[PDB]
Design a protein around this ligand. Structure first.
Ligand SMILES: O=S(=O)(c1ccccc1)N(CC(F)(F)F)c1ccc(C(O)(C(F)(F)F)C(F)(F)F)cc1
Length: 234
């Protein structure tokens, strides 16, 4: 693989991102002054457990759709069999959503963009999963300190999806080669931007995994349905 091939894979991944990112970074940054008032917060805390889980599962569904669209536009992914695609999307898609959320997270006041405004942890009291909420906030806080650029996000989330160490893969050799090529791309682009320093600072791969799993566990506990099943409907 040549320099031109590597730079093209970079441009193709970043383009696929830019087209599927759902929320424009500029919009999210500008919306940072648009903070929920006490009464609105109280308005959310008073809502039913059932309602809050309905709202949250719906936003998650939408976000997963965009991430699935991202994946389909990564070179090679479509060329994999339906089984291997779904194997990669099963946990991978939701792991990507949780990384993407650091863009909608403001470290200065520890708030998150939710349904049009920024609000802190207390917004989600009705859900009755404070430790799950804490885990998201703390993961998003640690990622924000890295100041991910749009392209770093793009490249890093491609690697989250395209990973050969996932249960029950068939064309495992071919996913290893797709993972290899995107690793070259990510590394090349980091050196070019003198941003190699983030490599050691990236969240341990199994931290994002165990976070995703615990959230999926609790999501299904509220009688919903695994996100992979829902996504299959489209
Ligand atoms: O917009 S969300 O509802 C959101 C929740 C918490 C903080 C900010 C934003 N949504 C974000 C998404 F990007 F997916 F749209 C979201 C919904 C639900 C979750 C959950 O992790 C779970 F369990 F449903 F997967 C939880 F409900 F627990 F928070 C996480 C994020």
């Amino acid at each position: 693989a040549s320099l031109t091939e590597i730079e093209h894979l970079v441009q193709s991944v970043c383009k696929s991102y830019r087209e599927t990112c759902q929320l424009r970074l500029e919009d999210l940054l500008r919306q940072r002054s648009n903070i929920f008032s006490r009464e609105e917060v109280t308005g959310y805390q008073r809502k039913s457990m059932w309602e809050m889980w309905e709202r949250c599962a719906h936003h998650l569904t939408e976000a997963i759709q965009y991430v699935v669209e991202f994946a389909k536009r990564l070179s090679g992914f479509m060329e994999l069999c339906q089984n291997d695609q779904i194997v990669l999307l099963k946990a991978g898609a939701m792991e990507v959503v949780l990384v993407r959320m650091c863009r909608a997270y403001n470290a200065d006041n520890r708030t998150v963009f939710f349904e049009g405004k920024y609000g802190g942890m207390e917004l989600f009291r009705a859900l009755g999963c404070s430790e799950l909420i804490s885990s998201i906030f703390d993961f998003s806080h640690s990622l924000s300190a890295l100041h991910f650029s749009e392209d770093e996000i793009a490249l890093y989330t491609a690697l989250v999806l395209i990973n050969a160490h996932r249960p029950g893969l068939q064309e495992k050799r071919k996913v290893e080669q797709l993972q290899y090529n995107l690793e070259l791309a990510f590394h090349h682009h980091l050196s070019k931007t003198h941003r190699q320093s983030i490599l050691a600072k990236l969240p341990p791969k199994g931290k994002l995994r165990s976070l995703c799993s615990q959230h999926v566990e609790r999501l299904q506990i509220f009688q919903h349905l695994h996100p992979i099943v829902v996504q299959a409907a489209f």
